Short mmCIF file of C-alpha atoms (C1' of nucleotides) in Angstrom, two decimals:
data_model
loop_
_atom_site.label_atom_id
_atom_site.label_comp_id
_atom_site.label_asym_id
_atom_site.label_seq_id
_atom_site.Cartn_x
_atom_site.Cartn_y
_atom_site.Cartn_z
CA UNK A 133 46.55 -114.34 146.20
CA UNK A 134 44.61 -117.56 145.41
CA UNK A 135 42.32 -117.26 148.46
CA UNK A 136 41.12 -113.34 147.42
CA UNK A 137 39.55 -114.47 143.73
CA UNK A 138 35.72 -115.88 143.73
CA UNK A 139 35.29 -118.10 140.77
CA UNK A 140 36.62 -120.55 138.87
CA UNK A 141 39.51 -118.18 138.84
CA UNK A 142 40.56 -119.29 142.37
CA UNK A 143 41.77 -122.88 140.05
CA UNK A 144 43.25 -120.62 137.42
CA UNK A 145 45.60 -118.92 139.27
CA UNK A 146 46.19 -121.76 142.02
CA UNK A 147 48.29 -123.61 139.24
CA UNK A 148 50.35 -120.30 137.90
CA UNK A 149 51.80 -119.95 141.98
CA UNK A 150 55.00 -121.51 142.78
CA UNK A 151 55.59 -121.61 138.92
CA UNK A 152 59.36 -122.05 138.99
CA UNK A 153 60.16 -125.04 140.85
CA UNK A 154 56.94 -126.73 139.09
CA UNK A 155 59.35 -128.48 137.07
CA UNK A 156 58.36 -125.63 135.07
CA UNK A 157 59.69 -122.64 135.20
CA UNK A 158 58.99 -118.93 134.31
CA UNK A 159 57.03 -118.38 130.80
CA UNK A 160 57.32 -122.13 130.10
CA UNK A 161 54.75 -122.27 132.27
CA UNK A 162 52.90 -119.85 130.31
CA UNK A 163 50.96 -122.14 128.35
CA UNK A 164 51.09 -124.79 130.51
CA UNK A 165 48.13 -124.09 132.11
CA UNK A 166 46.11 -122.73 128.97
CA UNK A 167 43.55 -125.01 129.10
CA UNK A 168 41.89 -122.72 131.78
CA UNK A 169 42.00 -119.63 130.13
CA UNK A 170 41.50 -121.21 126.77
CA UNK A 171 38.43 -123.62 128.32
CA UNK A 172 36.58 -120.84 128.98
CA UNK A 173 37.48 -117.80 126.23
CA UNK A 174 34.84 -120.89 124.38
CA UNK A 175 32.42 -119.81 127.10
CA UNK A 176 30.58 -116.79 126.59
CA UNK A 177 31.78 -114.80 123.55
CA UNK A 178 31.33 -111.00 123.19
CA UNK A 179 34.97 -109.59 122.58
CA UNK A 180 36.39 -109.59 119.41
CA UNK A 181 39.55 -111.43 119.93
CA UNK A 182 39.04 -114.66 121.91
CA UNK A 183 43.19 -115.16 120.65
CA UNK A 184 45.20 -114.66 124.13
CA UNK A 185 48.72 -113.92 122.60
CA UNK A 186 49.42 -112.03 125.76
CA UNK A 187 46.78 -112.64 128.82
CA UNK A 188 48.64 -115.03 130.60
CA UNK A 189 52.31 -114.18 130.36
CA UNK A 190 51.46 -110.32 132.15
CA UNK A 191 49.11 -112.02 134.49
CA UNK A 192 51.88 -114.77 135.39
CA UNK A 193 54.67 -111.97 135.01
CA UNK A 194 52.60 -109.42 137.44
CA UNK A 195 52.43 -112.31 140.14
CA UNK A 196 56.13 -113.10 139.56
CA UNK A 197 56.90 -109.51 140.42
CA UNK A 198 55.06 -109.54 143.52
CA UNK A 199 56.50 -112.36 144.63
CA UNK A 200 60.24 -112.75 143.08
CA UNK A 201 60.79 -109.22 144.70
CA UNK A 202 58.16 -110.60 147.41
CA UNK A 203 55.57 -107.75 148.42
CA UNK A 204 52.19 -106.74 147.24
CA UNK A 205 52.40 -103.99 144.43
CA UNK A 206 50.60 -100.79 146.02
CA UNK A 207 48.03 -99.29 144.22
CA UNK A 208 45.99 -95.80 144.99
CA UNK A 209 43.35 -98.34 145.92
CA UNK A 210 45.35 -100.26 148.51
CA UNK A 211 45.92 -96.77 150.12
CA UNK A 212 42.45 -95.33 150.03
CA UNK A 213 41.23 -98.54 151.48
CA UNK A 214 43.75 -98.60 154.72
CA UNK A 215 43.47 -95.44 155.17
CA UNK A 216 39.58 -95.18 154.93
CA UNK A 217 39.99 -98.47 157.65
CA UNK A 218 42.07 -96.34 159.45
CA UNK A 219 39.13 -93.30 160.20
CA UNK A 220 36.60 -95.62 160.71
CA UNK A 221 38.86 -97.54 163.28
CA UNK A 222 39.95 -93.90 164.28
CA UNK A 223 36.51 -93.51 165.25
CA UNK A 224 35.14 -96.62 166.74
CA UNK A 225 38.75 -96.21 168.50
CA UNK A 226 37.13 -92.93 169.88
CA UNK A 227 34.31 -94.45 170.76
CA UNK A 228 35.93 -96.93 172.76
CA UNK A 229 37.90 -94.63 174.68
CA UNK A 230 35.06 -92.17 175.71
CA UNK A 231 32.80 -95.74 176.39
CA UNK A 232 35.52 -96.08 179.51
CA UNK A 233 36.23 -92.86 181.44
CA UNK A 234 39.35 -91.40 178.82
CA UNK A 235 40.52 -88.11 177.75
CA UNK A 236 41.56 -88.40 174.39
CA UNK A 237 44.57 -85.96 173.70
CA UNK A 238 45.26 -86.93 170.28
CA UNK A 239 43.64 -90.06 168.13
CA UNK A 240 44.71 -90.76 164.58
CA UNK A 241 43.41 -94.24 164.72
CA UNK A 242 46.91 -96.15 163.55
CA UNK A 243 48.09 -94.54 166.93
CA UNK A 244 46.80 -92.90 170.14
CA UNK A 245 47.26 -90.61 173.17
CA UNK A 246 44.90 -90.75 176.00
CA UNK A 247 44.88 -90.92 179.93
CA UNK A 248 42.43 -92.79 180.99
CA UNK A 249 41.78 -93.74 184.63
CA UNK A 250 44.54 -96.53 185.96
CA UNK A 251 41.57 -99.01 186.92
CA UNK A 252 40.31 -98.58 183.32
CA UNK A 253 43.23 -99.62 181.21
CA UNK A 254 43.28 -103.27 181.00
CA UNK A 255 39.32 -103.93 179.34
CA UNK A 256 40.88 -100.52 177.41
CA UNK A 257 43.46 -102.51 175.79
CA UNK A 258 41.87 -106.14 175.39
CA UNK A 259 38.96 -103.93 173.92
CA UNK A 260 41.24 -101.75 171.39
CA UNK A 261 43.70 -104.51 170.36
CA UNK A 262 40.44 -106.56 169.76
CA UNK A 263 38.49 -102.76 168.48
CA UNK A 264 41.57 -102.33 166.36
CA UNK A 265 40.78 -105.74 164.19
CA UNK A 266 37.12 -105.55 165.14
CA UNK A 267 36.55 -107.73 167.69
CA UNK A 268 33.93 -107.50 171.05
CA UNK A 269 30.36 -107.87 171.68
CA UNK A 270 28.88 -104.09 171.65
CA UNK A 271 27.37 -102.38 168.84
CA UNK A 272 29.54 -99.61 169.27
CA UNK A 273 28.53 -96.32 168.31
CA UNK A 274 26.23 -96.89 165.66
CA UNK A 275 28.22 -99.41 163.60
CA UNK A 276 28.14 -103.25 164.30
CA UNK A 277 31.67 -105.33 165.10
CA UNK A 278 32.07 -109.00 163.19
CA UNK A 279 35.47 -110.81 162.88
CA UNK A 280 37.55 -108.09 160.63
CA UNK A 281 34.95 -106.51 159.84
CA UNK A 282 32.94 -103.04 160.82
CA UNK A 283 28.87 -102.83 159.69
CA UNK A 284 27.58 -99.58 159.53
CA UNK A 285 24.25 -100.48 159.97
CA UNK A 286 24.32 -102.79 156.41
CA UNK A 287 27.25 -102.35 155.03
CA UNK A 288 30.44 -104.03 155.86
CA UNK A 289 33.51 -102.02 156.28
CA UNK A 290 37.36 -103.89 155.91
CA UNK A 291 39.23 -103.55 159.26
CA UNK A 292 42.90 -104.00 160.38
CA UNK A 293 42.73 -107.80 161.66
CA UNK A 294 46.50 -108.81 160.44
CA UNK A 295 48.04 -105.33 161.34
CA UNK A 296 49.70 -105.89 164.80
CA UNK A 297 49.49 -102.62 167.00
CA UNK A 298 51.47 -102.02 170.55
CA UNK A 299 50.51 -99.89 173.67
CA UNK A 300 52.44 -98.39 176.54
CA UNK A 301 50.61 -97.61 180.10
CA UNK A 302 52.52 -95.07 182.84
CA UNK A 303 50.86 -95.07 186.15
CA UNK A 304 51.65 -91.00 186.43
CA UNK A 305 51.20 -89.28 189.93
CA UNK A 306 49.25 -86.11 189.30
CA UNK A 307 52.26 -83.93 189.81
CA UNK A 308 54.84 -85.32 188.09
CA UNK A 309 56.10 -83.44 185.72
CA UNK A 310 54.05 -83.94 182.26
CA UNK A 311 57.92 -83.45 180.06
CA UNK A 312 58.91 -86.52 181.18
CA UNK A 313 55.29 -88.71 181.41
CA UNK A 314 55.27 -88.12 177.89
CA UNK A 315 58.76 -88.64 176.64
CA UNK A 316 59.03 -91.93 178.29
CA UNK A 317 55.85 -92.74 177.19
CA UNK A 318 56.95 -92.32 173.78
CA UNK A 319 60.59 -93.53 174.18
CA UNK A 320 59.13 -96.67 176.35
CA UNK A 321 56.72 -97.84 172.94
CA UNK A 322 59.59 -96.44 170.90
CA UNK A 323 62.41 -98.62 171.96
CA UNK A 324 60.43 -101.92 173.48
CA UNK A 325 58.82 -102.20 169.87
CA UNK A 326 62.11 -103.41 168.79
CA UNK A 327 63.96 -104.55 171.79
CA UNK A 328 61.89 -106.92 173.69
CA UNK A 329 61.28 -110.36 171.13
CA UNK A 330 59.08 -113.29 173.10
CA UNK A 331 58.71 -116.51 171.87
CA UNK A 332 56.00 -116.71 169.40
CA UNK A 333 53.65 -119.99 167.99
CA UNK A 334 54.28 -119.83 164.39
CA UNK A 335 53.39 -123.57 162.40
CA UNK A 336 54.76 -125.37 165.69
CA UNK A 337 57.75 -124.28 166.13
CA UNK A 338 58.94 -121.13 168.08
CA UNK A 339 60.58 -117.61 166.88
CA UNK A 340 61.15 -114.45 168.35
CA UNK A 341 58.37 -112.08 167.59
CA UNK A 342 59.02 -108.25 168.01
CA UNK A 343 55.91 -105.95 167.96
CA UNK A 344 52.44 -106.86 169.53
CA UNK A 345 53.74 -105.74 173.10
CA UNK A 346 51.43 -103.53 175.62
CA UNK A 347 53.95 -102.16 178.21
CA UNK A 348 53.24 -101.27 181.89
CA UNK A 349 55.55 -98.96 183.79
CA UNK A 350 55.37 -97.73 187.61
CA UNK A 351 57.62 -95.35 189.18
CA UNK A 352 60.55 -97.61 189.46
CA UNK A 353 58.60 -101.40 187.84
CA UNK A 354 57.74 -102.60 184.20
CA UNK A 355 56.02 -104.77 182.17
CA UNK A 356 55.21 -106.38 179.05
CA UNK A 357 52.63 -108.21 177.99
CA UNK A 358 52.46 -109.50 174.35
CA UNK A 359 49.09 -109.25 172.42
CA UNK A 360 49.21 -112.59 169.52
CA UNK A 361 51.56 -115.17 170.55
CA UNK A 362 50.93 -116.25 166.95
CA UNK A 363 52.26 -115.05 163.81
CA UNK A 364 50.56 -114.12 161.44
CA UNK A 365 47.76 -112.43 164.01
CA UNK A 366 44.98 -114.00 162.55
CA UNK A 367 44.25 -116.08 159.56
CA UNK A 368 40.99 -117.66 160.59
CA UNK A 369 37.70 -116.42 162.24
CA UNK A 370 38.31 -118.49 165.38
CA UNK A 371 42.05 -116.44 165.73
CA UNK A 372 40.36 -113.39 166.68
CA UNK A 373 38.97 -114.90 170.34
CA UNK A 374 42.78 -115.40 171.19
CA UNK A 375 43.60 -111.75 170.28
CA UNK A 376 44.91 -110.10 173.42
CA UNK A 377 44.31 -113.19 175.72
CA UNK A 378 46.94 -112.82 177.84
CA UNK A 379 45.59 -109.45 179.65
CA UNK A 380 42.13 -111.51 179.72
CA UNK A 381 43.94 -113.84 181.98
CA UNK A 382 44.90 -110.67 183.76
CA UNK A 383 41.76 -109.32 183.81
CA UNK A 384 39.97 -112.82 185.31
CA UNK A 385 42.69 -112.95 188.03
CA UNK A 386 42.58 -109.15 189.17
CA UNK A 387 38.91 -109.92 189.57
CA UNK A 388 39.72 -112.34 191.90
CA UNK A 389 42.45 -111.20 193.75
CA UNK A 390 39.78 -108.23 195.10
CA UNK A 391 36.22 -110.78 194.90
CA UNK A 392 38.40 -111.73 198.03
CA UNK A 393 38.71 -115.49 196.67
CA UNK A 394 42.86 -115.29 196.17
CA UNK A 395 44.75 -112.95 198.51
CA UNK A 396 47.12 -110.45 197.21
CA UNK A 397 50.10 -112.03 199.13
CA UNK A 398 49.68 -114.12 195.65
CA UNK A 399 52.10 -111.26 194.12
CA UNK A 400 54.49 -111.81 197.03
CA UNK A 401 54.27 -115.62 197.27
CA UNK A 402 55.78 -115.88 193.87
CA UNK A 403 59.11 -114.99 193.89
CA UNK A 404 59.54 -118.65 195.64
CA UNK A 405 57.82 -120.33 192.97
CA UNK A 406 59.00 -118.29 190.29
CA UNK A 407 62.54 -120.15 189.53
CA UNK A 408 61.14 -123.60 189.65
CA UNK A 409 58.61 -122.33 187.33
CA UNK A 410 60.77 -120.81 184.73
CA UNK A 411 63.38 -123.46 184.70
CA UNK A 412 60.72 -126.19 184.17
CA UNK A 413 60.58 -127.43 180.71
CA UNK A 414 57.72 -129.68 181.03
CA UNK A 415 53.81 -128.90 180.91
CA UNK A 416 52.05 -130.89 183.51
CA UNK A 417 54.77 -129.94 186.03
CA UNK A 418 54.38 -126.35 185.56
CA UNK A 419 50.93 -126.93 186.01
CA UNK A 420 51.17 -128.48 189.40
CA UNK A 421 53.81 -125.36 189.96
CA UNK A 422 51.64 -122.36 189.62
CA UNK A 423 48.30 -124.73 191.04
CA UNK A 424 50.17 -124.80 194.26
CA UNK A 425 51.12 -121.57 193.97
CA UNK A 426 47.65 -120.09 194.06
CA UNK A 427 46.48 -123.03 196.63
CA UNK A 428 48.55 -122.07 198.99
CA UNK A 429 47.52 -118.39 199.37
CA UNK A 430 43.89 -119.31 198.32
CA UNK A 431 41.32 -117.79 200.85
CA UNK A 432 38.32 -119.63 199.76
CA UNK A 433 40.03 -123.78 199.75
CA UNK A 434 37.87 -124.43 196.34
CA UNK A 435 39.23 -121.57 193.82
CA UNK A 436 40.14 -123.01 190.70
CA UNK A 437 41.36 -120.46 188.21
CA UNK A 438 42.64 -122.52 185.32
CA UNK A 439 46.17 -120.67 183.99
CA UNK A 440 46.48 -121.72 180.53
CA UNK A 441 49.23 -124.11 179.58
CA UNK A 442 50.49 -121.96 176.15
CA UNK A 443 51.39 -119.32 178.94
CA UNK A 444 54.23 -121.52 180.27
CA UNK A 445 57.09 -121.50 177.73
CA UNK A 446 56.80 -118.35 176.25
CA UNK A 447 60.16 -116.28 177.13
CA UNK A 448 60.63 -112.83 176.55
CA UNK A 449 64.11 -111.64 175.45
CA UNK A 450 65.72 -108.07 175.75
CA UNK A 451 68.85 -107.29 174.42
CA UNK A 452 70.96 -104.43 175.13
CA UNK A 453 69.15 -101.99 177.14
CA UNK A 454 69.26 -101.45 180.82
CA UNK A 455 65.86 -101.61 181.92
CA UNK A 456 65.09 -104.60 184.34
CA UNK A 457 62.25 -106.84 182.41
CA UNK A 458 61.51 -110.13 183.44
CA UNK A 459 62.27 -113.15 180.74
CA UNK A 460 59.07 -115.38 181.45
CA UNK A 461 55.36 -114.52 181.18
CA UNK A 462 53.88 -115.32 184.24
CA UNK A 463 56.26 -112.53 186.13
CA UNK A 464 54.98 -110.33 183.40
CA UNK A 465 51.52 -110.82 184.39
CA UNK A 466 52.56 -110.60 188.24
CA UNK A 467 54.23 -107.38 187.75
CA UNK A 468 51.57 -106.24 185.60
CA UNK A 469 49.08 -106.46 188.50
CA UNK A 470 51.51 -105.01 190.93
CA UNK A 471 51.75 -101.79 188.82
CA UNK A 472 48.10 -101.52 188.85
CA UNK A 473 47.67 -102.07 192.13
CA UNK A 474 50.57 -99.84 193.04
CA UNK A 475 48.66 -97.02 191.85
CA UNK A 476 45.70 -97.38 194.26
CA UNK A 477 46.84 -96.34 197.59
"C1'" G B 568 84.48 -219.73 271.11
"C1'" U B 569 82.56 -215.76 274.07
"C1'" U B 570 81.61 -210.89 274.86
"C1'" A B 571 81.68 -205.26 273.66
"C1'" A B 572 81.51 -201.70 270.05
"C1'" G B 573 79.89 -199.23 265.46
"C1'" U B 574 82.97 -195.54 262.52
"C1'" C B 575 83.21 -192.18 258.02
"C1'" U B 576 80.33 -189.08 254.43
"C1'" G B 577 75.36 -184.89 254.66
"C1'" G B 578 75.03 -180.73 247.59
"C1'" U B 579 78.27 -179.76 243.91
"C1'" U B 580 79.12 -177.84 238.84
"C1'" U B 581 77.03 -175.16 234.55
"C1'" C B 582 73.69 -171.72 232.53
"C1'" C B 583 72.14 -165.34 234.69
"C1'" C B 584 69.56 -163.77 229.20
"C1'" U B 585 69.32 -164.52 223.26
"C1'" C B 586 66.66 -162.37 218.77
"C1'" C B 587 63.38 -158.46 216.52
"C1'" A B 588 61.31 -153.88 217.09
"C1'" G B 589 65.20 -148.24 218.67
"C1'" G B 590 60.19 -144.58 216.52
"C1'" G B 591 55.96 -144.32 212.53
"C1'" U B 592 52.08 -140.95 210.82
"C1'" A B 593 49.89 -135.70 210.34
"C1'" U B 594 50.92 -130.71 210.73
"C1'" C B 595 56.42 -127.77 208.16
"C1'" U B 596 53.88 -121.87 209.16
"C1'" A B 597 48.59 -119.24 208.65
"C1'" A B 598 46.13 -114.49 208.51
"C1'" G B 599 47.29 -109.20 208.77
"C1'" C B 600 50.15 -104.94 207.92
"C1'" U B 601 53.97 -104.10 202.13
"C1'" U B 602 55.08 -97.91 203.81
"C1'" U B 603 52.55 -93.36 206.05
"C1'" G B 604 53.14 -88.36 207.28
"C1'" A B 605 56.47 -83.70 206.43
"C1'" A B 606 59.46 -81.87 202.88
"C1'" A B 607 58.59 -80.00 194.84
"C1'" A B 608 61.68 -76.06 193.18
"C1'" A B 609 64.69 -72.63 197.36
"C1'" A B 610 67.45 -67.80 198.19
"C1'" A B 611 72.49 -65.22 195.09
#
RNA sequence: GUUAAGUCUGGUUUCCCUCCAGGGUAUCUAAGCUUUGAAAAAAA
């Protein structure tokens, strides 16, 4: 609330917040803070009753509403503006899905069908999740791309930066039947939007976020990959560059698994160090765990691809359903690759 | 007093190894190949 005014109504309101365990409590508080509103009605005079009477109790009463019954009271306005954010991400959305080699079979911005090429997902995602808050270096179609923010040559457009948005990926064989690509596409999003939770950063310690999930499926694997690993998504302008980081770190190792610098026995050298991995609860020691892990099936004795250390804890939980998903990150990211590189032969 | 005659014996005992060191270090698998080819919809 307090950080969307401009003026010296950001102090205003910044006092009539939390205005029941003040020691002051609802409409005492009314004209408690006064002096602000009557400070400046002696400011610049032009209406004919500078006598309040009424200003600040609604005002105070509206944010009580919206926050007593916590939510933010909709307006037409609130609609027309997400949904105006969603075309114009519908579109850029569009434009990032023809700018790879994609098919676009339905695109309503908030959601998406394509098929795509299966060496073409991974920038896909990392680019949309990113596209999707605005979020890359490419001016796009015509329109630029800042931090939550879309410039149409001048003007700058709002954007979805806080709203959270999964993806699914089958590797299909040509010939399998479509019926069942796409209803396990769907069903795959459907149910993994609310049954895999991962351990999420939220003001130190750790809960079990839901959503943010891009899922991978082969003919018999899966995986998941979560997008934020923070909660909310972003808050600051530095928040965006960890958007979708994870697949990054996919993205920087599949280029080296090929660049013939780590082999691909990488993806079957793990299953020995996966357990002492997981069960470590320590950073440096993980470290030295998944370091010797790519040493040892190095091909090039000088690689140093630097795993990042927030990459380590994170667990991924999955209640009650029989699909086999793997409870730790790093096997994510493993199978992820495998998948990919399943469907290349 | 005189003479005359020499005879016996010809290496014994003890100690015969004691103590420490009884393996140390490096390498502990590496690189490949991770499925391929036939069968995907059959007659009553």
């Amino acid at each position: 609330l307090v950080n969307a005014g401009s003026g010296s109504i950001v102090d205003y309101v910044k006092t009539v917040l939390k205005c029941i365990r003040e020691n002051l409590n609802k409409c005492s508080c009314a004209e408690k803070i006064y002096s602000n509103e009557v400070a400046k009605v002696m400011f610049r005079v032009n209406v004919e009753k500078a006598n309040v009477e009424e200003e600040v109790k609604n005002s105070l009463e509206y944010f009580e509403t919206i926050l007593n019954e916590g939510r933010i009271i909709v307006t037409p306005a609130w609609h027309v503006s997400i949904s105006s954010a969603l075309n114009r991400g519908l579109l850029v959305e569009l434009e990032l899905v023809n700018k790879h080699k994609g098919f676009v079979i339905y695109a309503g911005g908030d959601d998406l069908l394509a098929m795509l090429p299966v060496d073409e997902v991974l920038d896909f995602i990392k680019e949309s999740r990113r596209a999707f808050a605005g979020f890359g270096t490419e001016k796009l179609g015509n329109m630029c791309l800042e931090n939550g923010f879309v410039r149409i040559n001048n003007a700058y457009y709002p954007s979805l930066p806080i709203v959270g948005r999964s993806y699914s990926v089958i590797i299909a064989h040509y010939a399998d039947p479509l019926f069942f690509v796409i209803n396990d596409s769907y069903n795959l999003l459907e149910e993994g939007k609310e049954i895999i939770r991962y351990r999420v950063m939220y003001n130190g310690e750790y809960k079990d976020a839901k959503k943010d999930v891009a899922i991978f499926r082969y003919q018999g694997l899966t995986s998941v990959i979560p997008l934020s690993l923070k909660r909310p998504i972003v808050s600051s302008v530095s928040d965006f560059n960890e958007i979708a980081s994870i697949i990054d770190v996919i993205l920087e190792l599949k280029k080296r698994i090929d660049e013939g610098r780590i082999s691909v026995s990488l993806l079957y050298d793990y299953e020995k160090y996966k357990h002492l991995i997981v069960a470590s609860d320590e950073k440096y020691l993980t470290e030295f765990l998944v370091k010797d892990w790519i040493k040892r099936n190095s091909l090039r004795k000088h690689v140093e691809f630097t795993i990042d250390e927030k990459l380590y804890g994170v667990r991924l939980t999955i209640e009650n359903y029989p699909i086999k998903i793997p409870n730790d990150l790093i096997s994510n990211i493993v199978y992820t690759l495998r998948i990919i590189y399943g469907g290349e032969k």
